[PDB]
């Protein structure tokens, strides 16, 4: 809950939070497009396995990126 910049800038957490909603919508988030956010950061795989498991606990889960279409319903 450590909140954003006006800017729109995000923090590791904001940018979790982004995530974590996009993902709960979905129901599918995948790996590079959760890793894409965290550039911002400095981010390890180590890290970013407790985030999936937060996300896989919430009810997302991570697919690759060579792969999607579960969700493919909607242009944006």
């Given at each position: 809950a450590d909140k954003q910049t006006?800017?729109?800038?995000?923090?590791f957490d904001q940018v979790k939070e982004q995530l974590t909603e996009s993902g709960k919508k979905r129901g599918v988030l995948t790996y590079e497009e959760i890793a894409e956010r965290m550039s911002s950061f400095e981010i390890e795989s180590d890290q970013m396995d407790e985030y999936y498991e937060f996300l896989g606990e919430q009810g997302v889960e991570l697919i690759s990126e060579n792969e999607e279409t579960e969700d493919l319903e909607h242009h944006h």
């Open positions: 006006h800017e729109t800038e995000l923090t």
